[PDB]
Chain A
Amino acid sequence: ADYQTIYTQIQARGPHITVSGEWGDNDRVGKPFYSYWLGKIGDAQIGPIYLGASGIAAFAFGSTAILIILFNMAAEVHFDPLQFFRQFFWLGLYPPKAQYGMGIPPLHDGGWWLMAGLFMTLSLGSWWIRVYSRARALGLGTHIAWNFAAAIFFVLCIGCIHPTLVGSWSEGVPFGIWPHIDWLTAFSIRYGNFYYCPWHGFSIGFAYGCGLLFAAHGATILAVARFGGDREIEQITDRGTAVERAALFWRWTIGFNATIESVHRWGWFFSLMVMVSASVGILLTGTFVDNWYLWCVKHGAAPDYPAYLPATPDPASLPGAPK
């Protein structure tokens, strides 16, 4: 067996390396320190970390977002500490319960939710900038920043854009552990069962696919760790027996095969599409489809089943039912 693929049998210690940025090498704060148990299944050095304007900005905004959510959450258990700590999950900061349309809701009915929504957006924004820059600074491509954009855009879709499109702030995602979760059923119910949203389907397809691909890729590499397969950059510019054997494994099993670079492309693409497919589905929902099950029924896709218990007419439509 290859114990290396399970954990680092003999760790190595050596002088801390620093690859110089095209700027801000002077904002890397902190002393590298090493964890022995971390080193067993990862790199042992923790830190330093790069400060920077985008980063500080990101932190500043996110911290404000959080103070608004926590303060309101704290208002919910009427500032009792113990009940606060007890009821934390259940606690939340909600969007307008009332139909204000696109009108700015009062602070008591969603005003605060908007606020936090704003600061979170700027927080995410600044962080995007930082993710984009560090790449630029280090002379790297921006593939990560681009994958992140899609993720950020999704959030924008469910937090802002979909409520704007239909014209109600009441539709946004509450802040809070259980509350953000309850929204998922509120939203799917009103829009007639998200299982029947084609883009919900694509998204899940890509999400499962990421699981499939990252299990397959991770295992493939560990399986050719003996031939230095982990050194993927140099297996790119100079194919070695590692990625030859990785490729032939996959060719012989499924009939076609990637390369060591392209499989990260398949990977990046699948990751990206989870967020892309999902935004599309949100953009369409409420704008152009009210009830996805019925849309599907409209277009011939929906399954149908025999009555098992007797079919039950709507009472409300009977002869002289109340209302």
Chain B
Amino acid sequence: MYHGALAQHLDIAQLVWYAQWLVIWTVVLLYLRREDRREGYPLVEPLGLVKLAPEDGQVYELPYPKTFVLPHGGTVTVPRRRPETRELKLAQTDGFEGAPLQPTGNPLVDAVGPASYAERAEVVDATVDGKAKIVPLRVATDFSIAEGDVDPRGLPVVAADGVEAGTVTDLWVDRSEHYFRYLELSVAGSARTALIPLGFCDVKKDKIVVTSILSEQFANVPRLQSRDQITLREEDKVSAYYAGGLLYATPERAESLL
């Protein structure tokens, strides 16, 4: 007789093969694939002239709402209906839903395409003890550049067009993670500052190089409301602005690479 044998043609391992697969497709389809739907659902679309249904599929695919209780007060519940109210200066290039949109203004300023930002909270990211998290080193006093690294304060910022566009006045540090995230510059020919996220900067000994945008385009870099603080949504505005240059700083960048 055999260990595991169940019938004329059944055995344990073989049944457990079946159960194994079931556990997997269960967790994957009924759990994880629904967890994936806590942002951006329900899918937005055109509209119908007459429609009346709590369209069933849109209910079935969603998980039950979850709520995070936020560390410094408040709650957030996901999923939730979060339509994009803001007007988008874009226009359909052809007819079909597949068709790409095109900017009708300055996409850098309009913030469409790679220049877009999320409607993040207009609040200031905090450290764990309540302080503003991302702040210039003027404010962040117990913070310092590590011995060995270029201190960009003083250095010129140089744009994609090769032209000096400003001068670095400060570095903003993350005090939760001890990590610089922006440089601040006095814009040349303006009395504004710009922050530029450190990822858009090539840090040389003698200059800071920024390829995303031409010197001209630093003028319309987004403006903070406070000057020693920055909100989550501003971080998004600032970052998206340079990202947009990567497609839009000059006319040929949107076109076929090769």
Direct touch of chains A and B (CB < 8 A): yes
Task: Name the interface size band of chain B.
Answer: 35 or more
A-B contact count (CB 8 A): 159
Q: Please provide the chain B residues from 213 to 256 with a CB less than 8 Å away from any CB of chain A in the complex.
A: 232, 235-236, 239-240, 242-243
With contacts A234-B125, A269-B27, A288-B13 taken as known, whether A10 is within 8 angstroms of B142 at the C-beta atoms is no
Q: Which residue of A lies closest to B70 (CB)?
A: A237
A213 to chain B, nearest CB (A): 12
User: Does B118 sit at the interface, judged by CB under 8 A?
Assistant: yes
- How many of chain A's residues touch chain B, expressed as a range? 35 or more
A225-247 CB contacts (< 8 Å) to partner B:
225-228, 231, 234, 236-241, 243-244, 247
Q: Mark B15-59, 1 if CB is under 8 A from A, else 0.
A: 011001000100100001101111110000000000000000000
Q: Is the CB of B143 within 8 A of A13?
A: yes
Asked whether A271 is an interface residue with its Cβ less than 8 Å from the other chain, the reply is no
A280 with B144: in contact, given A227-B236, A289-B4 (CB under 8 Å)? no
Q: Mark B115-144, 1 if CB is under 8 A from A, else 0.
A: 011101100010010000000000010111
The answer to whether the Cβ of A299 comes within 8 Å of any Cβ in the partner chain is yes
From the candidates A199, A241, A266, name the one contacting B236 in the complex (CB within 8 A). Answer: A241
Does A215 interact with chain B (Cβ within 8 Å)? no
CB-defined contacts of A234 to chain B, threshold 8 Å: 125, 232
Let me know if A3 and B239 touch, CB within 8 A.
Answer: no
Instruction: Find out whether the CB atom of B178 lies under 8 angstroms from the CB atom of A295.
Output: no
| Chain B CB within 8 A of A193 CB | no
Q: Is the CB of A238 within 8 A of B76?
A: yes
Q: Does A43 interact with chain B (Cβ within 8 Å)?
A: yes
Interchain CB contact under 8 A, A14 and B121 = no
Known A-B contacts A226-B199, A234-B232, A247-B39; A10 and B149 likewise in contact (beta carbons under 8 Å): yes
In the complex, which of the residues A13, A237, A241, A284 contacts B118, with contact meaning CB atoms closer than 8 Å? A241
Q: Flag whether A9 is at the interface (Cβ < 8 A).
A: yes
A262 touches B36 (CB 8 A): yes
Within the complex, the shortest CB–CB distance from B208 to chain A, in Å, comes to 10
Give CA–CA (A198, B239) in the complex, Å: 48
| Between-chain CB contacts (< 8 Å), 21 pairs | A2-B200, A4-B199, A8-B179, A10-B145, A12-B144, A12-B145, A12-B173, A12-B178, A44-B146, A226-B239, A228-B239, A237-B76, A241-B116, A244-B116, A258-B32, A259-B37, A261-B35, A262-B35, A277-B20, A284-B16, A295-B13
| Residues of chain A whose beta carbon lies under 8 Å from any beta carbon of chain B | 1-5, 8-15, 17, 19, 36, 39, 43-45, 198-199, 202, 225-228, 231, 234, 236-241, 243-244, 247, 256-259, 261-262, 265-266, 269, 273, 277, 280, 284, 287-289, 295, 299
> Which residues of B does A touch, CB under 8 Å?
3-4, 11-14, 16-17, 20, 24, 27, 32-33, 35-40, 68, 70, 76, 116-118, 120-121, 125, 128, 140, 142-152, 171, 173-181, 197-203, 232, 235-236, 239-240, 242-243
Given contacts A19-B128, A244-B40, 13 further A-B contacts (CB under 8 A): A2-B200, A9-B149, A10-B152, A12-B179, A13-B143, A198-B13, A234-B125, A247-B40, A258-B35, A261-B38, A265-B35, A288-B12, A299-B14
